[PDB]
Structure 1
Amino acid sequence: DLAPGIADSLRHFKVLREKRIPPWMEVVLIPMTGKPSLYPGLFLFTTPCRLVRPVQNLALGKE
């Protein structure tokens, strides 16, 4: 019940560059469907060599 809030807080911190969260962080929250979907968990990646691309976050209005 707290994990979407933590994921949105980390995306907020990432796109606003607030709490030394890198702007290239992948905040993945794989949800618990109760079905044979992907293995759930809040996965956070900051390592290099990943592909990353700019979109615009419409809630914040920033890239």
Structure 2
Amino acid sequence: DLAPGIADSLRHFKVLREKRIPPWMEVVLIPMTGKPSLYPGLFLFTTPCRLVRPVQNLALGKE
């Protein structure tokens, strides 16, 4: 019950360039249900070879 808020807080840091979260960290939160969905858990990638793309973040308008 803290994973959603943590993911949203981390996404707000990267968007507003707060803390030291790299502007390009991927905060992923693969939810867990009872179904055979992808393995659950909060990943956070910041490695130097991933592909990224810009999108206008609504609720903040901060790209």
Identity of aligned residues (%): 100
Count matched residues. 63
**5+ long unaligned stretches in structure 2:** none
CA deviation vs aligned residue, 1:4-63 (integer Å, no higher than 9, x gap): 000000000000000010011100000012100000000000011100000011011110
Q: TM-score, normalised by structure 2?
A: 0.97
CA distance in 2, matches of 1:31, 1:8: 14
Q: C-alpha root-mean-square deviation of aligned residues, in Å?
A: 0.5
Q: TM-score, normalised by structure 1?
A: 0.97
Q: Which consecutive aligned stretches of 4+ in structure 1 deviate over 6 angstroms post-superposition?
A: none
Corresponding residue number in structure 1 for 2:34: 34
